Amino acid sequence: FHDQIAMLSHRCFNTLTNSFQPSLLGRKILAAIIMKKDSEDMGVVVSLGTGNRCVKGDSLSLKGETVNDCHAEIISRRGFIRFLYSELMKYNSQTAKDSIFEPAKGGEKLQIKKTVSFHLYISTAPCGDGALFDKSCSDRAMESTESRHYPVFENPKQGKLRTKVENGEGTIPVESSDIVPTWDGIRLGERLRTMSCSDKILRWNVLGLQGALLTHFLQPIYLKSVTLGYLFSQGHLTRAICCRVTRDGSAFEDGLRHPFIVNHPKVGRVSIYDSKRQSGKTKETSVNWCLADGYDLEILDGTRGTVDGPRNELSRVSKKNIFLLFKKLCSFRYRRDLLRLSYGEAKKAARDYETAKNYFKKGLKDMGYGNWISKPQEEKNFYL
Amino acid sequence: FHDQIAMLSHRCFNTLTNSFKILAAIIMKKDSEDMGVVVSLGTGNRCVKGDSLSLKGETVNDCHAEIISRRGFIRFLYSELMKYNSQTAKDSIFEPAKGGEKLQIKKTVSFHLYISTAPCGDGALFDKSSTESRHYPVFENPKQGKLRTKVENGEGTIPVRLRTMSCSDKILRWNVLGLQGALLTHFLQPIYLKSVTLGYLFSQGHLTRAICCRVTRDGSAFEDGLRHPFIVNHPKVGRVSIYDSKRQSGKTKETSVNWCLADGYDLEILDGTRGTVDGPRNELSRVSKKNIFLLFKKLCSFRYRRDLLRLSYGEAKKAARDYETAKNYFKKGLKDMGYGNWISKPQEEKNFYLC
RNA sequence: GCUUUCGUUUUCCUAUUGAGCAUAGCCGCGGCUAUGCUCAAUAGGAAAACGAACAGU
Ligand SMILES: O=P(O)(O)O[C@H]1[C@H](OP(=O)(O)O)[C@H](OP(=O)(O)O)[C@H](OP(=O)(O)O)[C@@H](OP(=O)(O)O)[C@H]1OP(=O)(O)O
Ligand SMILES: O=P(O)(O)O[C@H]1[C@H](OP(=O)(O)O)[C@H](OP(=O)(O)O)[C@H](OP(=O)(O)O)[C@@H](OP(=O)(O)O)[C@H]1OP(=O)(O)O
Ligand SMILES: [Zn+2]
Ligand SMILES: [Zn+2]
Ligand SMILES: [Zn+2]
Ligand SMILES: [Zn+2]
């Protein structure tokens, strides 16, 4: 099953970039999101991302003209958001049966179908909490019929909240670092910190894959499976994405309001590993692709968060673009009240998601993990 | 021009540190031909917490670079005014003012400011997106111009628990109310700046709004209301031609450094977290409000002014009706333009009697 | 001891400008056109070795 998913992703990517320059043959982390219409359906790759770089501290934009992280699975979810936006433009009364959404209780917001299953394929494991192991301890693949998760908590430093920092390799925890995120502080030379990968999947599961922007229109979309081409671990990943939150009993889950409930998807490894993995050859290119694009494999610069080339125009997976798509959806959905408001105010306007996020940070702090280190408030709130 | 200012400031810093990062400095120029000499110098990017507050004003609060440099310059001005006498008025930079009651600085002498980076607050609100003489600010979003308060454990600010105002705001307060401090308006006319040199960041519209031109956004109705001899100063804004192109994202030193012309080689170190001298003995800071009050009392005793020897620090500060009116009008004008409310500390901190 | 940014050395290619040597051609002893090699300056792309960025697994 996982072998089919990996072959699907690799085939789509290779058939897309067959006629491009050879300079794309270097080391790259390839991450895709594949949809399955039903159990018997073969499945089609619905979102493709590459790139392993983040903007520099000076490169940050007060008008949202950068992609803060160009990472493989992060770009994969940005393309997934673009796919969801495109589908919501496609979604209507006539194509409801073919579409991938069905209205929830009251019809205010939609949810994915139960047959339609989402599977996040990644070449390697997500950075941060999901990478607490060693290469020589990479466990093999077994076929378990049960859906029961077995997370591991052997050390108190496992499960904390971590951040990836510019110029700084690895993932650094969210300690009680009293440096409040401030814009001009960063400009004068304070490091920029970004929420890590697995720490940004805990949210996708406790809160939603759609982010806080998209929860105004659809119910939280949950991963149905995570397939890893490399660095797969059962307990570590299962803790990192779904059950680090509920280590201390159901008191965390029961407090969380519907529909923002925890969810333990199925995890898996590709049937046959890929032999080639060299430490070097890492390139600044980032390939972004959505299913609605066609044959355009957009190329970006991760050191600067913009399109590769001397022109270096605006990309399409950036906060400005995603907010333009937000405005397009609002115009399509007649969301006039939210159509004339700002960015951070729009993120906070999701009362349910905001309260769920606050409960998330409160519980993460109570279990001795950490708060939710964020960007400066004037960077997460801008106008166009 | 501005490259000369930067080189002079940096060589003076090196000269002070030969016997032994952000920087602000104030230099004096007797004339165009003269090279110029430093009078104030400071560093630092820290502010005290909410637990080290002093009811008697024994601890310095705002430990940033520009503010401590201004302080130090105030101490130099106290020493320079004390050195005045009728025998050596010609060689001194002071001359009697109108009415003969108060001194003033000479017309040829000018004061310039160099800041190694854009000041915090409204001075670094721009992303990557000396021929002139007119000031042209930029007003793009309502966020620009809002008063900001320093945060604890950080270089940045937050828009408007102990709270201190941002560096750019304070350098607006100087330009409006002069550099002469609070207790020296009895005997001294206000002293202003002439130029500003931002050696590592620069915007021809952002700094002029940060320091000078934001009190002129809604017209010239703020200068006329202010009473003479208090006027808004517009220093000439410049950037060093060749700058350090490389940005350090690592940790920095929190200790502030200060020096003034009258000190000589007595470089002083402070810790911004607490507000005391760097040392296990927990020494009293020589630039604290206590020392300023003591020097003011010494100046009144020397000048045979027994009138102000009875009053306390707060009473002496409010005794000058013109200056307090100028302050109150400045704060009201900042409030009126929708830039926020100047967070004034309670009067109990500065209302103490020496024992 | 594995896990983004700075640089140093070497190699290769493309583009622009200038000089030296040799060959073929033409015009009124002189001058001009084309080709091969060497050097000097700048821009872009690729690879190898080494060094530092801070900080947590
Ligand atoms: O870019 P992403 O990795 O997809 O996540 C970004 C952003 O993180 P970045 O630092 O990378 O920009 C925010 O994460 P933090 O600021 O907390 O670190 C978060 O928004 P919040 O700050 O409100 O949590 C999230 O938003 P969402 O919840 O919708 O997924 C989303 O923001 P964008 O939609 O602007 O990309
Ligand atoms: O010593 P500084 O850092 O340069 O600032 C202090 C103080 O500011 P902070 O308490 O924030 O550090 C006062 O500002 P407020 O807090 O009261 O708003 C104000 O003196 P006032 O109490 O009279 O306002 C000011 O300037 P000034 O020279 O006019 O006094 C000066 O006070 P000191 O000169 O006593 O240090
Ligand atoms: Zn990552
Ligand atoms: Zn689980
Ligand atoms: Zn500052
Ligand atoms: Zn001005």
Side-chain angles (χ1 to χ4, degrees), chain A residues 1-2 4-24 26 28-37 39-91 93-97 99-107 109-133 136-141 147-149 151-177 179-253 255-272 274-277 280-282 284-333 335-382 384, chain B residues 1-28 30 32 35-84 89-101 103-216 219-222 225-226 228-240 242 245-253 255-267 269-270 272-273 275-282 284-312 314-331 333-334 336-346 352-355:
Chain A
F1 176 85
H2 307 299
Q4 305 292 337
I5 221 73
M7 155 285 271
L8 229 52
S9 288
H10 276 341
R11 196 178 62 191
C12 178
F13 171 61
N14 284 344
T15 206
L16 217 58
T17 182
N18 69 336
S19 60
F20 265 70
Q21 60 278 351
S23 75
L24 307 184
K28 62 178 175 23
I29 313 283
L30 163 53
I33 283 187
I34 305 198
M35 192 175 55
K36 302 224 173 194
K37 309 289 293 300
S39 59
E40 294 287 346
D41 201 323
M42 185 29 174
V44 81
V45 175
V46 307
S47 207
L48 188 100
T50 312
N52 44 81
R53 283 197 204 305
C54 304
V55 316
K56 261 178 210 174
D58 54 79
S59 296
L60 273 310
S61 179
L62 287 210
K63 255 182 62 193
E65 285 189 8
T66 46
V67 290
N68 317 98
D69 47 358
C70 295
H71 282 237
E73 63 282 349
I74 284 87
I75 285 300
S76 190
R77 187 186 62 96
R78 307 229 67 164
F80 183 88
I81 294 178
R82 296 188 52 243
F83 166 37
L84 297 177
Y85 275 129
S86 177
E87 220 302 335
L88 283 147
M89 333 282 179
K90 296 176 251 176
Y91 192 107
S93 60
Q94 301 179 12
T95 166
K97 50 194 64 58
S99 308
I100 302 315
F101 306 106
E102 75 153 345
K105 301 180 178 181
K109 55 174 55 182
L110 319 174
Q111 34 182 153
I112 55 170
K113 271 185 172 58
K114 343 321 164 188
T115 53
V116 176
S117 297
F118 282 126
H119 312 253
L120 175 83
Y121 166 63
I122 322 184
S123 176
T124 46
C127 42
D129 206 9
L132 297 150
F133 48 79
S136 60
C137 299
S138 298
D139 300 324
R140 288 189 174 187
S147 63
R148 198 224 59 174
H149 287 231
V152 290
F153 312 94
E154 63 270 3
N155 290 29
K157 69 194 206 170
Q158 322 292 73
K160 262 142 180 62
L161 272 195
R162 326 202 96 92
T163 193
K164 54 194 186 193
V165 64
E166 314 308 320
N167 294 28
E169 31 192 347
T171 36
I172 296 170
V174 161
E175 327 97 316
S176 58
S177 286
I179 303 180
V180 179
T182 50
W183 167 254
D184 48 37
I186 287 180
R187 287 237 66 169
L188 321 183
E190 287 181 348
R191 261 175 163 175
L192 181 84
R193 301 159 303 176
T194 322
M195 283 331 298
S196 175
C197 319
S198 46
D199 316 328
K200 202 155 330 186
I201 325 186
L202 204 45
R203 174 218 286 253
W204 301 349
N205 295 320
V206 193
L207 297 91
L209 250 186
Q210 76 290 340
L213 271 63
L214 258 180
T215 191
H216 295 250
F217 324 110
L218 50 85
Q219 285 254 128
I221 295 177
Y222 294 71
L223 275 175
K224 181 59 187 344
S225 148
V226 184
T227 166
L228 258 57
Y230 230 77
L231 306 173
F232 177 79
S233 194
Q234 164 47 358
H236 290 326
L237 185 64
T238 43
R239 158 191 65 194
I241 39 181
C242 70
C243 315
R244 142 179 57 173
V245 75
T246 70
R247 193 201 42 180
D248 62 0
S250 63
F252 210 138
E253 177 168 17
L256 296 152
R257 186 75 179 95
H258 174 269
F260 298 63
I261 211 72
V262 58
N263 155 281
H264 317 259
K266 185 194 157 27
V267 300
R269 170 206 165 187
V270 181
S271 300
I272 278 305
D274 196 2
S275 301
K276 49 106 174 173
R277 183 229 63 91
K281 331 156 303 305
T282 89
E284 69 86 19
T285 178
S286 93
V287 189
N288 319 146
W289 189 68
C290 168
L291 188 69
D293 273 358
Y295 273 92
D296 53 69
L297 305 90
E298 184 168 282
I299 307 183
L300 268 61
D301 190 339
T303 49
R304 308 169 17 180
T306 186
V307 185
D308 211 349
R311 170 60 189 86
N312 60 261
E313 65 275 32
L314 182 60
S315 71
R316 66 180 180 255
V317 302
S318 72
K319 308 172 73 160
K320 186 170 281 178
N321 198 40
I322 299 310
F323 197 54
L324 285 169
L325 299 171
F326 200 156
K327 303 222 173 100
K328 290 175 180 56
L329 202 44
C330 293
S331 55
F332 183 81
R333 304 179 73 84
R335 207 83 149 100
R336 293 295 200 274
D337 322 288
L338 190 47
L339 195 65
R340 307 303 166 93
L341 169 160
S342 153
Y343 201 58
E345 272 75 5
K347 270 188 182 173
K348 265 63 174 180
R351 274 321 320 151
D352 228 309
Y353 184 109
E354 171 60 87
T355 314
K357 176 193 335 186
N358 288 288
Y359 195 0
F360 184 84
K361 337 194 276 207
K362 175 62 166 53
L364 266 294
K365 190 53 178 180
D366 297 346
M367 321 200 35
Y369 288 137
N371 205 270
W372 193 251
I373 287 307
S374 305
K375 292 297 194 300
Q377 203 64 29
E378 45 254 12
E379 160 172 326
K380 320 169 43 181
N381 199 317
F382 46 81
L384 305 186
Chain B
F1 186 20
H2 296 90
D3 203 285
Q4 173 144 0
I5 275 182
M7 291 334 307
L8 183 43
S9 308
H10 281 285
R11 60 193 56 155
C12 291
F13 204 139
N14 229 24
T15 317
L16 269 310
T17 54
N18 288 121
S19 58
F20 288 78
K21 199 165 69 68
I22 316 102
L23 169 73
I26 293 190
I27 66 195
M28 90 175 314
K30 291 291 212 307
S32 62
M35 197 169 97
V37 57
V38 286
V39 313
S40 148
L41 163 147
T43 88
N45 56 90
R46 311 298 292 186
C47 170
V48 304
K49 303 188 302 298
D51 59 339
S52 299
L53 175 70
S54 178
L55 183 63
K56 306 160 297 305
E58 170 156 350
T59 59
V60 191
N61 308 169
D62 195 325
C63 294
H64 271 208
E66 304 83 313
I67 330 298
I68 299 297
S69 74
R70 187 262 215 162
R71 191 152 217 92
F73 165 77
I74 272 284
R75 289 205 300 102
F76 147 82
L77 197 49
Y78 261 130
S79 178
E80 211 206 347
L81 183 52
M82 275 269 278
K83 287 179 182 174
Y84 185 95
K90 53 172 304 301
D91 273 8
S92 178
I93 319 102
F94 290 114
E95 60 175 5
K98 284 262 178 312
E101 191 216 0
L103 286 312
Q104 77 178 11
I105 215 76
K106 277 178 178 172
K107 304 308 294 178
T108 69
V109 186
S110 56
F111 292 106
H112 312 286
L113 175 81
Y114 159 70
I115 310 175
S116 181
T117 323
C120 72
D122 211 86
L125 286 200
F126 48 86
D127 40 334
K128 298 252 282 192
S129 67
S130 177
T131 38
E132 300 185 50
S133 168
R134 192 61 210 290
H135 261 196
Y136 296 128
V138 293
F139 287 79
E140 309 138 297
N141 39 2
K143 289 161 212 273
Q144 291 163 353
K146 274 277 302 174
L147 263 65
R148 329 236 297 179
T149 294
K150 319 189 198 311
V151 315
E152 301 179 10
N153 330 118
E155 233 150 62
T157 80
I158 39 154
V160 291
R161 175 175 167 93
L162 199 63
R163 300 183 99 191
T164 326
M165 301 307 302
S166 56
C167 315
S168 301
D169 304 322
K170 286 188 138 137
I171 328 181
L172 172 65
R173 173 136 166 286
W174 313 342
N175 291 342
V176 178
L177 274 186
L179 261 78
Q180 86 302 298
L183 308 173
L184 291 89
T185 324
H186 302 139
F187 330 107
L188 256 179
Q189 304 296 279
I191 293 184
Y192 298 104
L193 289 168
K194 190 58 63 180
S195 71
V196 54
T197 297
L198 324 185
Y200 196 158
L201 260 69
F202 190 99
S203 211
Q204 60 276 329
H206 285 88
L207 185 83
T208 80
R209 188 195 63 254
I211 63 171
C212 40
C213 287
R214 82 171 104 166
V215 283
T216 86
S220 303
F222 186 81
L226 201 60
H228 165 96
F230 290 95
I231 54 184
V232 285
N233 179 258
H234 281 270
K236 282 301 306 300
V237 185
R239 54 171 271 181
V240 189
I242 292 300
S245 307
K246 218 95 207 166
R247 196 204 81 167
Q248 182 183 3
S249 299
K251 306 307 173 186
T252 176
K253 308 168 186 178
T255 55
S256 300
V257 183
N258 47 321
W259 173 91
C260 94
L261 182 49
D263 287 7
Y265 293 359
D266 230 336
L267 199 65
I269 312 299
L270 292 192
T273 312
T276 87
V277 192
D278 167 71
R281 281 193 165 184
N282 199 337
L284 177 45
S285 165
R286 72 188 182 186
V287 302
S288 316
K289 329 174 76 181
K290 207 78 169 182
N291 263 266
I292 298 297
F293 194 40
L294 169 62
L295 262 172
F296 173 75
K297 280 193 179 305
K298 175 185 298 182
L299 182 59
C300 326
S301 165
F302 187 85
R303 188 154 287 255
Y304 284 119
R305 285 297 296 268
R306 202 180 307 273
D307 186 15
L308 313 161
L309 287 165
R310 286 280 190 173
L311 294 82
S312 63
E315 300 324 329
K317 280 183 155 102
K318 346 309 295 183
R321 278 312 306 163
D322 286 7
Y323 187 166
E324 297 306 319
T325 281
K327 203 145 90 148
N328 299 334
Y329 183 74
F330 169 50
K331 293 188 173 179
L334 279 191
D336 195 6
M337 319 205 278
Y339 292 8
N341 292 261
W342 190 288
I343 276 171
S344 156
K345 288 199 179 189
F352 66 98
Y353 296 79
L354 256 172
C355 303

